[PDB]
Amino acid sequence: DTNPRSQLHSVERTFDEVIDPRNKNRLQSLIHPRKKIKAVKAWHFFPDTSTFDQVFHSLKFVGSASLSKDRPLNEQLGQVNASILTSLFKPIEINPHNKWISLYAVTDKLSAESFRKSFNSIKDDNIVNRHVIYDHIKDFDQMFRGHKKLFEDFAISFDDISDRAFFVPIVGRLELKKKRIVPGLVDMVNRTNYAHIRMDLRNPSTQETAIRDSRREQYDPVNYSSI
Amino acid sequence: IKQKLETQFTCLFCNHDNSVVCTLDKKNSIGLLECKKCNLSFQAPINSLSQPIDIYSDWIDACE
Amino acid sequence: IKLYGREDKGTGRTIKATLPYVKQDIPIVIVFRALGVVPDGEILQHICYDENDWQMLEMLKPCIEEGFVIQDKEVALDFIGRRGSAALGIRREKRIQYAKDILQKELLPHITQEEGFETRKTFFLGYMVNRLLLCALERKDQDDRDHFGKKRLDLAGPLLANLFRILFRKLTREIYRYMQRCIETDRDFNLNLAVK
Amino acid sequence: SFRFCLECNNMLYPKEDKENQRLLYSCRNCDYTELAEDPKVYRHELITNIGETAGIVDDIGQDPTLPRSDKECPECHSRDCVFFQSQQRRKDTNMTLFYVCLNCKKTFRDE
Amino acid sequence: GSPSEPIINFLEEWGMEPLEDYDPAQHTKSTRIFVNGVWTGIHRDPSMLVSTMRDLRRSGAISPEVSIIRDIREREFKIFTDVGRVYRPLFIVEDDESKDNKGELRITKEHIRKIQQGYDDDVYGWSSLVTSGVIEYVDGEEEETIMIAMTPEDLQTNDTAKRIKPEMSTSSHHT
Amino acid sequence: HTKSVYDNGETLDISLPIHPKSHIPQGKQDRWVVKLPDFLDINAEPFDPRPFEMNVKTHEDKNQELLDKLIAVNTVRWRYAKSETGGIFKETNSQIIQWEDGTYSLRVGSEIFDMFTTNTDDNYLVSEHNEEGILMTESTLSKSVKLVPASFQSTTHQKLAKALSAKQKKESYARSVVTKEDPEERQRRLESQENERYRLERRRKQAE
Amino acid sequence: DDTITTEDCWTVISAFFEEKGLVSQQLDSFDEFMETSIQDLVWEEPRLILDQPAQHDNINKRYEIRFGKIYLSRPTMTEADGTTHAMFPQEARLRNLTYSSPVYLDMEKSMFTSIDGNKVHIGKVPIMLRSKFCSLRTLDEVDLYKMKECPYDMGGYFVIN
Amino acid sequence: QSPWLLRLELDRARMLDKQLTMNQVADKISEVFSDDLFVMWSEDNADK
Amino acid sequence: TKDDFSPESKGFVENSYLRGLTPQEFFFHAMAGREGLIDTAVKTAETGYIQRRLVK
Ligand SMILES: [Zn+2]
Ligand SMILES: [Zn+2]
Ligand SMILES: [Zn+2]
């Protein structure tokens, strides 16, 4: 079946044999080849259109840098916590040899909850000016490994109401380890990071939105091509 | 107990070689490099695992 | 990886590792920090796999106590480089680079050679230390030297390969020397005369 | 099992407060200090038994080279069991057998 | 001697997870995996993995001289593709409990008659026997983990001249 | 009490542009990171049958051609499907199936690949903002998922086994050749010419 | 089915010896060495590099030579008069020759310059008898007698002098 | 005196087998260490 | 099987030379004979050295 016509025919055959998630009878017809177990639920597998412009990195804590292991840190930031779900990271590099990552979070639970609700409910064109102040928590040493292929890793998100599953590409993996600051460099350390960072929520500019749409035009041109 | 050892290091002021003697005192945690010709003395702290190479490297770093 | 200290002798039972192109033995905690794992909890995670095994922990205690003096990656690399049997008087930056060279390469070369790929070396050091302690605690019999499953036989292939590698390196050196001698004339050497 | 500093990850060493007459565990690279719960600072066993029955795995019943017996399991009361002698192999080790059933995997002896 | 890249590919395909995704506290029961003496990863269900690798080797997908060893006591699963390992062939006994042919030699008179003829009924030699899953090579390290019968007569349960076979009464049953 | 190092209070008034999301997770901001196997590929681009048919490549190497065919037929794709009512809908050839035991499987066509999930803690997903040099978190990666073929009899597994078995069979680097003359003839003739020009050069230099 | 007797075991062993032989390990090892090992040994160090920052006008010239394919040939005898002909082991034994074959290497020379080559003969490798590169691998049974070679000879050895 | 307590448990079986007395062990320790260590020993009727 | 201390599992040849040895007994007996040969070939040199020293 090396014939290009055969490959194309296989492609349309695979496309046509997709099982309707609402079809309970056809879903029960499908049986696991080895487990011999009926199917219960199904989800469509689709890519995500609004997120391809952004760049996604899998961030992990290595060893003692675990937030669960750091009991005082967890107690201060809350024993899922919205503060963790709204944290900010600031990579700063003095020189090629010296590098670290700065972590910021919202200490107040009410402010973090309001910010998380506003961020997760962005489906309209009205955003309130939430001047949220982020407080520094800790710094970690960082190393990065890049993926040779574009879609080497992909994260899967679900949507039960639409019976879909949206996946997003992962560009690289960032690892963080606990770093003990040398006592002889605290003078420059105090001049590197900041005690607070203020985030202001504003609607994206028209030019930046057009740039992001042009970037997304590679994936979906039917709904985003410039005219 | 102070330990006196003859070392083959090179003095950076007189340029004579094989005229360096390392004196380390583990009791007071100190190490002295003295030039047998220049009579210059270099003092640096030492640890439990310190060796004459450690004091020599410390002297090299101090020199530059 | 030698385990010093006899039964009820030699005070602590320190563990000193031996590295290639290094004149003196080095305690295991120092080399672990040199690879880039400075906290002690992470090192214990790398070595042991059961926190209830207090015997191996108390065996490891003297090593941690001895290596407590070094508490950073760069200082550990400098300590490794100082004894690296290289030229005397090497600057601190060049000493650290020499240590990185001798640590990435020539240290368990069969595992890897590329940069940023040293976690596997740390895990293998943990495995070796685990095996050493496990046999020291008499929990397992020492590996049988006569076990025929641990032997290999070199047939005509490997023997001829070794000999040919030696001879071809000799031929390459001869070509190099002839090229250096003959470039002085700036002539278009046939390259059919350089070879012997 | 010994603890470590929760912010420095280094080993915590026991310490005594002269003014308070209390045992504490203090890190050496940091000022962190935590109260000690147990008074057993150090313990050394001259004669030990650990490593005798601890050598158990869940899938030891998949080894074909192990003999199969018919001893009665206290838990499952199965008719099939696998037995082996002590994993600890000191020169003065006893030759007692440890029997493992295929369902509950409980280790027991015929003593 | 064989390249180890296909072995690593198969191991990664069949669920082995690399070292950077490993934490000793978390995977307190996983099995280490060695390939040619280097620790390459960990696995949580070594039984199905060793079954799959052995079946692949018997089907000819993996080179028959590749050594597959499982050390259940030490929780290790070693693989060797090195050069210079002395091996020898052995018959294969069907040890699957779910199979009706349990406890019997896989080779049958059909294979013998095919060998005698010299061809299959839609060249049939020793290599065909090895790749058809009736004979396999084992080295000195894989022999540690197998139970061998001396003769096909040993596979099933008063003369002064004939010799005496071992009683082997210590084991209630053999597999 | 490790006193806080930073007490300057300096603050940045940076405002980040955020775009509305086509979908929103419900009940939990959880995502599963899945490693992509070699036999499975993702084609985010909409399926274009004519370029696909016109760009099929044929190679002499049977193993490479079979691997390419397998990855192409197993690649996850999508295309625009014209609805019977005249509208346009996104149609995909890939689905996720959950069995009665609770396990999940990735399905492409008739092929089914099982999912092996390992729980991972302190693993999160972030969004990179390179122009501002800061990282904005997105959600939490709770589980790492591996994709495994369902059974031996699966066509994908058999094709992979065939490709890998025949890949290591082909090994012949040295190329044979026929010698018609003495292999040492070139060296001796060139040495003779070199000695001749040495003599000529010595004479010229003595005459120069 | 039917039971397997001892005679069937001997049938299987006969099949084994029909395919493998008694000295198969020597021949297999040598075939592996000749087919792939020599090329990899050459490619272990595939570059010889010389550089020169000529100021005698900064002209940095790099002279680099690369090693290419390995070409092997059947064993050949070169007489004193100059004629070359195929060599068979019996002639080597009778005349105290060495049963070896030439090895040819491709060398490519490059002249890198920044202002700021064919099959060369490297040696002769002795050939193991009855291996893949021996002249007796072919020739069937009848021609083996014309070459004064015993059909019972199994190979697996070299002929040096 | 120091608060640091140093105690050790003697195997009753071998202690009986060697026909030794707790008082004898305490006396030996006292003789080898004079009065530098305060020593208390459990009675023979104790469980351990 | 593992952990088998029966007489036939640790080198007790039950048969006689007339009756013939089973393969396991054959291998164990070969091991013992090899030990005998090695012991002779090693002790001869030590005894020779001892006698030379005594004579001198
Ligand atoms: Zn001087
Ligand atoms: Zn600390
Ligand atoms: Zn049971």
DSSP state letters, C21-77? T-SS-EEHHHHHHHHT--SHHHHHHHH-S-TT-HHHHHHHHHHHHHHTT--SHHHHH
In C75-129 the beta strands, taken as DSSP E runs, fall at none
- F98 contacts A40 by C-beta, under 8 angstroms: yes
Compute, in angstroms, the gap from residue D73 CA to the centroid of ligand 3: 6
Cα separation, G69 vs G107, in Å, equals: 8
Tokens encoding C84: 């690296």
Number of domains in chain C: 1
Rounded to the nearest 10°, the torsion over CA C155, C156, C162, C164 is -170
How many CB atoms are closer than 10 A to CB G140?
A: 8
Q: How far is A64 from chain C (nearest CA, A)?
A: 7
Contact G63 C180 (CB under 8 A): no
Q: Label the pairing between strands E135-139 and E87-91.
A: antiparallel
How many helices and strands (H and E) does chain F possess?
Answer: 4, 11
In angstroms, rounded to a whole number, what is the distance separating the alpha carbons of residues I12 and I8?
5
Question: Cα–Cα distance between D78 and D98 in angstroms, integer?
Answer: 16
Helix (H) or strand (E) holding A85: helix A82-85
CA distances from G157 to A98, C163, G27, G154 (A): 62, 17, 9, 9
Amino acid at the residue C72: D
C-beta separation of G25 from C155 below 8 A: yes
Phi-psi region of C30 (alpha: psi -120 to 50; beta: other; left: phi over 0): alpha
Residue C59 lies in a domain: yes
**CB contact at 8 A, F89 and F80:** yes
Cβ neighbours of residue G17 under 8 Å, at least 6 residues apart?
A: none
Whose tokens are 């102040």? That residue is: A133
DSSP letter at D12 equals: P
Is the Cβ–Cβ distance between B35 and B19 less than 8 Å? yes
How far is Cα F79 from Cα F52, in angstroms, rounded to an integer?
A: 13
DSSP string, A161-206: TTTEEEEEEE-EEEEEEE----GGGHHHHTTTS-SEEEEEEEPPPH
Q: Which run of H or E residues covers position G126?
A: strand G119-126
F92 and A46 Cβ atoms separated by less than 8 Å: yes
Q: Return phi, psi of residue F182, to 5°.
A: -70, 125
Cα separation, A44 vs F93, in Å, equals: 8
DSSP string, D76-92: T--S-EEEEE-S---TT
β-bridge mates for residue B41, sequence order: B34
Crossing angle between the packed helical segments G24-32 and C156-183, to the nearest 10 degrees = 30
Q: Is B38 annotated as a binding residue?
A: yes
Suggest the residue from D60, D66, D87 to mutate for an interface test with chain E (most E CBs closer than 10 A).
Answer: D66
The angle subtended at Cα G119 by Cα G117 and Cα G125, nearest 5°, is: 140
Beta bridge partners of D107: D100
Dist. CA C138–CA C134, nearest whole Å: 7
**H or E element in which residue G144 lies:** helix G142-146
Give the start-end residues of each E strand in F60-161.
Answer: 76-82, 88-92, 94-99, 104-108, 111-119, 123-129, 134-149
List, as own/partner pairs, every contact residues A212-217 make where C-beta atoms lie below 8 angstroms and the sequence separation is at least 24, other chains included: A212/A53, A212/F19, A215/A52, A215/A53, A216/A49, A216/A50, A216/A52, A216/A53
First and final C-alpha spacing in chain A:
41
- Asked whether A91 and A101 are in contact (CB, 8 A), the reply is yes
| Rounded Cα gap, residues E71 and I2, in angstroms | 14
Breaks in chain E after (C-N > 2.5 angstroms): 122, 157
Element (H, E) at G112: strand G100-114
Task: Give CA–CA dist F157/G94, Å, rounded.
Answer: 58
Confirm if B37 and B14 have CB atoms less than 8 A apart.
Answer: yes
Q: At what angle do helices C54-67 and C119-136 cross, to 10 degrees?
A: 120
* Any domain includes C19: yes
CA nearest B48 in C: which residue? C69
**Domains, in order of start, for chain D:** 1-44 (2.20.25.10), 45-111 (2.20.25.10)
Which residue of chain C comes nearest to E36, CA vs CA? C110
Are A51 and F44 spatial neighbours (Cβ–Cβ below 8 Å)? no
Technique used by the depositors: cryo-EM
Give the helix/strand (H/E) hosting G53. Answer: strand G47-54
Which residues are bridge partners to G113 per DSSP? G61
Q: E with I: how many residue pairs have Cβ under 8 Å apart?
A: 31
Q: Tell me, in angstroms, the distance from the centre of ligand 3 to residue D81's CA.
A: 8
Reference E125, options G4, G23, G19; nearest CA is G19
Do residues A15 and F91 lie in contact, with contact meaning Cβ atoms separated by under 8 Å?
yes
**Residues in Cβ contact with I27 at an 8 Å cutoff, skipping those fewer than 6 apart:** none
Provide the Cα torsion E57, E59, E60, E61; round to 10°. Answer: -70
| Euclidean distance between CA atoms C28 and C17, whole angstroms | 6
3-state secondary structure of C10: coil
| SS3 (DSSP) at D11 | strand
* Tokens 């978390």 -> residue: E26
| HEC letters along chain E | CCCCHHHHHHHHHCCCEEHHHCCCCCCCCCEEEEECCEEEEEECCHHHHHHHHHHHHHCCCCCCCCEEEEECCCCEEEEECCCCCCEEEEECEECCCCCCCCCEECCCHHHHHHHHHCCCCCCCCHHHHHHCCCEEEEECCHHHHCCCCCCHHHHCCCCCCCCCCCCCCCCCECC
Residue C171 covered by a domain: no
Q: What CATH number corresponds to the domain at position C35?
A: 3.90.1110.10
Chain F residues with CB-CB distance to G76 below 8 A: 179
C188 found inside a domain = no
CA distance A152 to F36: 6
Residues D91, D94, D95, D97, CA torsion sign: negative
Q: Which one of the ligands is nearest to D10 CA?
A: 2
Helix (H, G, I), strand (E, B) or coil at C18: coil
Q: Is the dihedral of CA E54, G24, F176, F187 positive or negative?
A: positive
Alpha-carbon distance of G138 to G157, in angstroms, equals 17
Q: What are phi and psi of E2, to 5 degrees?
A: -140, 150
Q: How far apart, in whole angstroms, are the C-alpha atoms of residue I32 and residue I26?
A: 10
Within a domain: residue C183? no
Burial category of E136 from C-beta neighbours within 10 Å (exposed 0-12, middle 13-18, buried 19 and up): buried
Q: Resolution for this model in angstroms, one decimal place?
A: 3.1
Which residue reads 């020793």 in tokens?
A: E126
Tell whether G144 lies on the interface with F, counting CB pairs under 8 A. Answer: no
Q: Does the B1-64 domain belong in CATH 2.20.25.190?
A: yes
Please state, as a whole number, how many other Cβ atoms lie within 10 Å of the Cβ of residue I40: 9
Q: Give G32's DSSP letter.
A: H
Among candidates A45, D45, B40, which has minimal Cα distance to C58?
D45
Q: Which residues contact F36 (CB under 8 A, 6 or more apart)?
A: A149, A151, A152, A153, A154, F42, F147
CA-wise closest residue to C19 among C101, C136, C127: C101
Domain around C86:
1-152
In whole angstroms, what is the distance from residue A151 CA to residue F37 CA? 11
Tell me the two tokens of residue A185. Answer: 């460099």
Cα of F177 vs centre of ligand 3, distance in Å, is 70
**Residue B51 phi, psi (nearest 5):** -135, 160
The token duo for F33 is 């990171």
A28 close to A39: Cβ distance less than 8 angstroms: yes
Domain boundaries, chain B: 1-64
